[PDB]
């Protein structure tokens, strides 16, 4: 920092894919979302 | 097996490494 002199780390803000498992549309409408290498305490903080 | 496997997910710029389905 170019005032304290203190060593920060960079790391990217998580990314990743998202997989819908479906049962299938000719048994049921369900469906359950996979956010992949991504912790569950960020998941729901994303636009759409 | 012990040896085998003593011989031998990163994040990056859009890189991502799936894990296998049989550990
Ligand atoms: C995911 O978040 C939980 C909740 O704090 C934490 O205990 C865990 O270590 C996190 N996973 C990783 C890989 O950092």
């Known amino acids: 920092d170019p005032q304290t002199l203190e060593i920060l780390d960079i790391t990217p803000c998580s990314f990743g894919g998202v997989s819908v498992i479906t049962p299938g549309t000719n048994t049921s409408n369900q469906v359950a979302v996979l956010y992949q290498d991504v912790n569950c305490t960020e998941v729901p903080v994303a636009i759409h | ?23």
């Open chain 2, 1 to 23: 097996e012990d040896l085998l496997f003593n011989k031998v997910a990163q994040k990056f710029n859009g890189l991502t490494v799936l894990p296998p389905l049989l550990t």
